[PDB]
Amino acid sequence: SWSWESYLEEQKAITAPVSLFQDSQAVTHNKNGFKLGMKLEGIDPQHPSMYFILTVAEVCGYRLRLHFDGYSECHDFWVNANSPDIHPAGWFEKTGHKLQPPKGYKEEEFSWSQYLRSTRAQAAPKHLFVSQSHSPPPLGFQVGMKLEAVDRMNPSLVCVASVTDVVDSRFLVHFDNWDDTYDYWCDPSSPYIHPVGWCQKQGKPLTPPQDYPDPDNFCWEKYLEETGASAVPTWAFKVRPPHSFLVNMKLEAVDRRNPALIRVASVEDVEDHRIKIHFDGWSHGYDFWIDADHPDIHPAGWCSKTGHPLQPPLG
Ligand SMILES: CNCCCC[C@H](N)C(=O)O
Known part of the structure; x- marks a missing residue:
């Protein structure tokens, strides 16, 4: 070899x-305990704010290929068994998140029990998941807080952003008034996020929410007043060492x-x-x-x- x-x-x-x-x-x-056919919940890498029903389509070493139930195989993707982006069946319900149903289902026509019976499948066991929302939340970051964040798909842009989801020790950064295509999960040490007012103290331009009226004159204090939202506190940002x-x-x-x-x-x-x-x-x-x-x-x-x-x- x-x-x-x-x-x-x-x-x-x-x-x-x-x-x-x-x-x-x-x-x-x-050990990778995931097996061919087991079903679970996970975010869509293309739409990170959304959760879907997934089936293990392939197992290889400490990795697995996931398939979106009812959808094209062209959407299949690979993750490591210790991925924090997958969760056990029933997770969305226990944590207050919304679950997109398999293709062919209305959301109310969905219950894991009927689904598993109809597909004669087994849900991947709870003990295999590193993320089940039992661990501590990231300190200082709560859903609804505002911040400034680099658009990782357009890194020259530092935009007005919000925290829209919090799972265990991570949170979802969302770009105000855009869909979730540019959102990304990260933790307090991410080098891509900054407290409100950062761009100003840096002399770097700030990119306001999509189609924000009179963009040239965006004012954080005004936007925060309009939204009633608070800024993630500065003490919360603990950027990692290079x-x-x-x-x-x-x-x-x-x-x-x-x-x-x-x-x-x-x-x-x-x-x-x-x-x-x-x-x-x-x-x-x-x-x-x-x-x-x-x-x-x-x-x-x-x-x-x-x-x-x-x-x-x-x-
Ligand atoms: C959160 N930033 C999104 C930037 C999108 C840029 C693209 N050229 C557009 O304007 O559609």
């Missing part, structure tokens, strides 16, 4: 130490073109909070920037220890 050890010798290279990764990205001793990944360090990363695959990778370039991934043996055209805390990058040896195939360098 291909060997990391042999590869490092051949390339005179080094791996990114485990210490540079979050424990969740590095942990390999947890990561310590150095160029040329090697690691393992999920392929962004074909998520089923994980390949041998190297750090091509770095920023304070992101690293540019290069897939050994492939064109640099495939190189991509990714946040250092992304769940899809892991230390060398992750695939082997978890039982997931690792694609060696092209050629």
Whole structure:
């Protein structure tokens, strides 16, 4: 079999130490208890504020492929078994969230008991989920508070934002007057969020809510008065320290073109909070920037220890 050890010798290279990764990205001793066919609840990666009924369509190592019941397979997506974005059947009900029903169902025609009987399926057991809303909420962040946030799809924009959901230790950042397509989950240390008035103290422009009247003259105090909303308090923002990944360090990363695959990778370039991934043996055209805390990058040896195939360098 291909060997990391042999590869490092051949390339005179080094791996990114485990210490540079979050424990969740590095942990390999947890068993993946998810099984083909089990059903559960989870957010739609395309619409992060929404919850759907999902079925385990494939299991591979410490990862699983999820399918949106009743919908096209083209919507399928992969997550790690320790994902905080999935929850046990019944979770939405116990936490006050809304659940979009499977294609073909009206929301009232939905009850997990009838559904499971009609599909002769089993709901994934509760003990397999890291997120069940039993842990503490993020400090200082409550649904309804306002803040300023970088649009990660348009990073040159720091917009007026709100906290619209809180699950365990994370919260959902929402861009005022847009749908949820630009929303993202994060924690108090995210380098993409700032307290109200940040843009002003920085001399950077602030982007007001979509179609806000007379945008050129947006005033936070006025908007907060209009909405009766309060600003996330400044003490709540505890941005994380820049990561310590150095160029040329090697690691393992999920392929962004074909998520089923994980390949041998190297750090091509770095920023304070992101690293540019290069897939050994492939064109640099495939190189991509990714946040250092992304769940899809892991230390060398992750695939082997978890039982997931690792694609060696092209050629
Ligand atoms: C939260 N920011 C959203 C920015 C969307 C930008 C896009 N060009 C548009 O105007 O549709």
